[PDB]
Amino acid sequence: MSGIVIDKEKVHSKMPDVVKNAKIALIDSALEIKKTEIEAKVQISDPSKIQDFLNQETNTFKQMVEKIKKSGANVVLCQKGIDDVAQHYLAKEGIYAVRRVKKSDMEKLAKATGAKIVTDLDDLTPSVLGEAETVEERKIGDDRMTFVMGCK
Amino acid sequence: MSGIVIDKEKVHSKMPDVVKNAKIALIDSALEIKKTEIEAKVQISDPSKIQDFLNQETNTFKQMVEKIKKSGANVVLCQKGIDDVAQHYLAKEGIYAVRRVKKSDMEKLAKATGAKIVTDLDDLTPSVLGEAETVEERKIGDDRMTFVMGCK
């Protein structure tokens, strides 16, 4: 019982309330494509290739999000936002996810869990993850916070 | 040998050069989603649901385009543009497709083939198609035109 509390709650529904022996993935990168990248890439596209382009992205993205499960991670604390496509997948995988985690929390979590805050998903591997005996969400007053306990 | 010539060529590659006993689908509707509908629907969306929305569209669209094969049509002459996603599918189905067909040509084709120019895909059925002994593309001088012959 040594830890970090985070005033954030799991981003999704059917995500676990508790995770015993958590393999924590600290992602500094955003698990979502900015409205500006898409709008810009859509405007500059030939009218006929808009849907083709959009499919390539959603597939690349789904392939990229999947690199989280492949690392064996069962908990992912993202510094940025996590979009709905990424929320659903992580939910089905039973992965506990939190978004908009403060930079300070990310740094603390890093040192307390021995995880390496990755800025890109192709760098997410079993070795850059953090360890913690238990990661869980609970009601603390009128707030739902995330508790990272037993920081190994 | 009675017909309509169209100064347009098949929109795709691996589409047939000839179609014997053509079952012609006259589509007044566009087989593509306007850049403006998407850009607008993307801007007004919550940043996180952009990709979800985009997937729903591509699937609805692919389901809608498929209503062409289901009618038994082997030739589709669209009054508007046909996007790349729609070009590929039609190509795999061996369906001869042409886009940006002039309104006058559409009306002529209608009366000469007995087809009903549909403005919506859910109205495409075996009965609203036209008949023609042969629909084919060929080089006429420095142009590649479409010839609808044996108009039944």
Side-chain angles (χ1 to χ4, degrees):
Chain A
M1 290 187 113
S2 156
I4 308 304
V5 192
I6 300 182
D7 205 359
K8 294 291 180 189
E9 55 180 59
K10 56 186 185 204
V11 299
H12 224 243
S13 60
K14 309 166 174 181
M15 289 196 164
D17 275 287
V18 187
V19 172
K20 293 181 179 182
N21 301 116
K23 295 179 181 182
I24 312 171
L26 266 37
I27 311 175
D28 182 274
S29 199
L31 288 192
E32 75 160 49
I33 307 179
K34 296 179 181 69
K35 169 180 290 183
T36 68
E37 187 182 335
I38 295 184
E39 223 175 301
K41 276 186 183 181
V42 174
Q43 170 68 51
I44 213 50
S45 189
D46 283 290
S48 50
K49 290 200 67 71
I50 293 173
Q51 293 198 49
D52 277 74
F53 149 73
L54 293 182
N55 292 179
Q56 295 169 172
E57 282 200 324
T58 67
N59 287 338
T60 300
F61 190 69
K62 204 153 184 187
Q63 290 306 280
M64 184 182 90
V65 174
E66 284 172 0
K67 287 189 179 183
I68 297 171
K69 169 190 65 181
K70 295 180 180 61
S71 73
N74 53 2
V75 171
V76 34
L77 305 174
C78 180
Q79 191 166 140
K80 264 74 178 187
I82 300 179
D83 71 55
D84 284 18
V85 181
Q87 298 182 36
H88 179 81
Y89 170 74
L90 292 283
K92 179 184 280 189
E93 307 318 304
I95 299 163
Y96 185 108
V98 178
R99 63 179 178 176
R100 272 79 133 288
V101 168
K102 297 171 58 180
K103 180 184 180 179
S104 49
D105 288 343
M106 293 296 277
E107 302 177 307
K108 294 179 180 180
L109 282 155
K111 200 68 184 299
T113 66
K116 284 296 181 300
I117 303 178
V118 295
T119 43
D120 192 358
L121 278 269
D122 65 9
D123 296 323
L124 240 204
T125 61
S127 61
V128 301
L129 303 178
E131 279 69 61
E133 270 295 310
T134 169
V135 165
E136 61 182 27
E137 191 213 62
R138 58 175 52 192
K139 299 180 295 299
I140 299 305
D142 63 303
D143 283 348
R144 305 198 67 127
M145 308 170 90
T146 298
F147 290 89
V148 184
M149 296 174 253
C151 277
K152 300 169 286 187
Chain B
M1 290 187 113
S2 156
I4 308 304
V5 192
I6 300 182
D7 205 359
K8 294 291 180 189
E9 55 180 59
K10 56 186 185 204
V11 299
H12 224 243
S13 60
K14 309 166 174 181
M15 289 196 164
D17 275 287
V18 187
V19 172
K20 293 181 179 182
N21 301 116
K23 295 179 181 182
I24 312 171
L26 266 37
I27 311 175
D28 182 274
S29 199
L31 288 192
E32 75 160 49
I33 307 179
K34 296 179 181 69
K35 169 180 290 183
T36 68
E37 187 182 335
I38 295 184
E39 223 175 301
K41 276 186 183 181
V42 174
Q43 170 68 51
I44 213 50
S45 189
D46 283 290
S48 50
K49 290 200 67 71
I50 293 173
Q51 293 198 49
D52 277 74
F53 149 73
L54 293 182
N55 292 179
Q56 295 169 172
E57 282 200 324
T58 67
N59 287 338
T60 300
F61 190 69
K62 204 153 184 187
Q63 290 306 280
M64 184 182 90
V65 174
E66 284 172 0
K67 287 189 179 183
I68 297 171
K69 169 190 65 181
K70 295 180 180 61
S71 73
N74 53 2
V75 171
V76 34
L77 305 174
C78 180
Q79 191 166 140
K80 264 74 178 187
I82 300 179
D83 71 55
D84 284 18
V85 181
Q87 298 182 36
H88 179 81
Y89 170 74
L90 292 283
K92 179 184 280 189
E93 307 318 304
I95 299 163
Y96 185 108
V98 178
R99 63 179 178 176
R100 272 79 133 288
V101 168
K102 297 171 58 180
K103 180 184 180 179
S104 49
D105 288 343
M106 293 296 277
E107 302 177 307
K108 294 179 180 180
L109 282 155
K111 200 68 184 299
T113 67
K116 284 296 181 300
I117 303 178
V118 295
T119 43
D120 192 358
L121 278 269
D122 65 9
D123 296 323
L124 240 204
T125 61
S127 61
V128 301
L129 303 178
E131 279 69 61
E133 270 295 310
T134 169
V135 165
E136 61 182 27
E137 191 213 62
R138 58 175 52 192
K139 299 180 295 299
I140 299 305
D142 63 303
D143 283 348
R144 305 198 67 127
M145 308 170 90
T146 298
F147 290 89
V148 184
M149 296 174 253
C151 277
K152 300 169 286 187

